[PDB]
Structure 1
């Protein structure tokens, strides 16, 4: 239930700090954590587990009660090296408590504390925990991240670009290869990252990146970048989406579409309805009916409902001023069925969790994102005031 997210993050930043001050021909390998459930047990069974606590002026046994204790349940349950991270003023050193300290801590006067320790099994090789466990005194998150980016500027980059597009990206690759279910090489080559991160152009909205401290300033840059694009009445915009990674998708796809068409496809000066495309094996008919229930119509480009005709899918609709009547408001299809291309190219293409597409080209703008909840994308497009 704990999951110690911030500690789990601390050693990722440690790893990137290790790669930071490193010479050529140096390699480092990460080892995942047991929070992932994989019988394959890939990674040499070299998992690591950590926890993080702060606000203690000088080291004592009393201050650090619960952490070490809570580790032992894991042992009783079943190369899993337990470790602890913390920073306290005047304490800069790594230690290993010997036998008498373990026997000191074994007994606990706090009763509800031992209430669960009763869960512990008797068969414990006491000194294994001690020799395996190690305590680390390193700088707290604040200054460590401060120096992280302060030095990341040292290589030579644009001062602002690093905040919103680079620093969130690397930690993502790190923790990805950390806990990826299927196997691959942990070995990391330093110089090649510089080659990859330079060319990579994407923004990442995910569970780990939000916890990062800089988050809160990556939102607004993206919000202010798209303002010039979304202040036009007549434009041709395209969307592609992959619904595997997204959470709670079947219940949130509809509200998003309604909110978008309410503001961007609801008047006489809006003469080019948008297009939505999905990749996979999704069933559209249900979505079509659920939207009709709300009061909207769609163009699917099917005369007889076997295959697609491109010319009908890219036609212009009828409009009437007084009273307003709109033939259709949005376009829907599946990417596999659409074969060919439009007579006129997109002005803006959006790709959500898609790696590449055939319509990319020099004139088109290609925004890219990695999303886990759709509520995040609305704030980017100015359909709500506050983020999650």
Structure 2
């Protein structure tokens, strides 16, 4: 349907402003939006957003009410809300019964069409007791207020915009919607330390539609430039493919790009390694890459189990005419046991919590992605995003 996320975005952002502005020893919890078994008896809410008028007139905003009333119609326990911004309005305004009927009224031809869909027998006074309306200010000023508040709290100015705030809102979005056994309330004291200790970045549906979208990508892109300039260095990837969309098809594109930019030269001595965690079947991808033009190094002499010395070897290279014995390394994480003699200069964890190759003298960059294109952009493979 409409699925106008800006409403839920406003709602979670306002909750965030509350949490940052909260007293010690206080538990605040939120109700998960409907659009996600309907867990929680009265912990569900749906919203819309609209801010284009010079003065407050209830007439113009017909649309949200129809679907919300229909939504109440569809099922019973579950609350409903709304947020909009017009000049000259604050607070909550309770409509009357005749006023809501006028919204019910077929004032226009579309509305006469729509009213027929809603049932004849429906509550209105109980509905109003059950549904309230809330006003809001301009959204961009609100997003600015959140960041200004965090500055006032005390954080490094550069670190705030890039990493702290999106990862912070991510927890709100996880709590709002989940299917597991755990609590639904956040205390500021335990909340803040968690975010301050852990460093990682997140790209996902809600994170994309924010004020600081452009400022998020470039700040990261600029960090990895020093690393990717080098001709020869060890790089290791760990991907978890459950969440990513259209993995089977896009992974080949990504690999061909990475090899054509970073493993197609005579001074490119050490190829990269890809390790996939899951229940994946590698033979298909291997065959497809063979059809593409590339050749892989599996590690298996007899297709039973892996040998570490063979997976980490150096290939033969001929200069003119140019050839490579192999251009990449592929394996499954579980099967591999042990570690290399030399430590990785970089390790890229994608959708992964921990790994046993970590150490102090090894760099570790982490991400949480829903589309692979954002990584193609992060690694300079493509010019633009969305």
The two structures share one fold, judged by TM-score above 0.5: yes
**Deviating more after overlay: 155-164 vs 331-340:** 155-164
When structure 1 is superposed on structure 2, of 316-325 and 116-125 the one drifting more is 116-125
Matched with 2:14 is 14
Q: Describe the superposition over 1:127-148 as per-residue Cα deviations: whole angstroms up to 9, x where unpaired.
A: 1221122121222211111111
Decide whether the 8 Å contact of 1:319 with 1:327 is kept in 2. yes
Equivalent of residue 63 in structure 1, options 60, 63, 68: 60
Kept in 2, the 8 Å contact 1:237–1:347? The answer is: yes
Q: Matched residues in 2 for 1:92 and 1:160: separation?
A: 34
In structure 2, what is the Cα distance between the partners aligned to 1:321 and 1:224? 33
Q: What are the Cα deviations for residues 159-193 of structure 1, in whole angstroms up to 9, with x where unaligned?
A: 01111101101111001110112242111111112
Q: Considering only aligned residues, what root-mean-square deviation do their CA atoms show, in Å?
A: 1.0
Which of 254, 257, 261 aligns to 1:256? It is 254
1:289-332 deviation line (CA, Å, top 9, x unaligned): 00000111111110011001110000000001110011000000
Contact kept, 8 Å, 1:42 with 1:183, in 2: the verdict is no
Structure 2 residue runs without a partner (length 5+): none
1:371: how far off?
0.2
For residue 81 of structure 2, give the secondary structure of its aligned residue in structure 1. strand
Secondary structure in structure 2 of the residue aligned to 1:49: coil
CA displacement at 1:14 relative to structure 2: 0.8
The gaps in structure 1 that reach 5 residues or longer are: none
- For residue 120 of structure 1, report the CA deviation from its aligned partner: 0.6
1:75 positional shift? 2.0
- The answer as to whether partners of 2:33 and 2:177 remain within 8 angstroms in 1 is yes
1:49 to partner: Cα distance:
0.9
Question: 1:89 & 1:112 partners in 2: Cα distance?
Answer: 28
**What is the total number of aligned residue pairs between the two structures?**
383
Deviates more, 1:184-193 or 1:204-213: 184-193
Q: Is the 8 A contact 1:95 1:135 kept in 2?
A: yes
Displacement of 1:93: 2.1
Give 3-state SS (helix, strand or coil) of 1:331's partner. Answer: strand
Alignment partner of 1:102: what SS?
A: helix
Query: Residues of 1 paired with 2:148 and 2:50: CA distance?
Result: 25
> Is the Cα–Cα contact under 8 Å of residues 79 and 130 in structure 2 kept in the other structure?
yes
Q: Could you tell me how far apart the structure 2 residues matched to 1:381 and 1:52 are?
A: 36
What is the Cα deviation at residue 69 of structure 1? 2.0
Residue by residue over 1:18-42, the C-alpha shift from the partner in whole angstroms, topping out at 9 and shown as x without a partner, is 112211112211001111xxxx332
CA distance in 2, matches of 1:203, 1:184: 24
Contact 1:96 1:131 in 2 (8 A): no
Q: Is the 8 A contact 2:56 2:87 kept in 1?
A: no
1:59 is displaced (CA, Å) by 1.4
Whole-angstrom CA distance in 2 between matches of 1:122 and 1:181: 36
Moved over 6 A (4+): none
CA distance in 2, matches of 1:289, 1:103: 65
How far apart are residue 221 of structure 1 and its match? 0.6
2: CA distance, partners of 1:109 / 1:94: 25
Tell me, in whole angstroms, the C-alpha distance in 2 between the residues paired with 1:61 and 1:194: 40
Deviation at 1:215, TM superposition (A): 1.0
Task: Give the TM-score normalised by structure 2.
Answer: 0.97
- 1:253-297 C-alpha deviation (Å, 9 max, x unpaired): 001000000010001100000000000110000001000001111
Q: CA deviation at 1:116?
A: 2.2
CA contact (8 A) 2:33 2:45 kept: yes
Worse overlay, 127-136 or 190-199 = 127-136
| CA positional deviation for 1:102 | 1.8
- Among 69, 73, 77, the residue aligned to 2:70: 73
Cα distance per residue 1:181-207 (max 9 Å; x no partner): 224211111111221111110000000
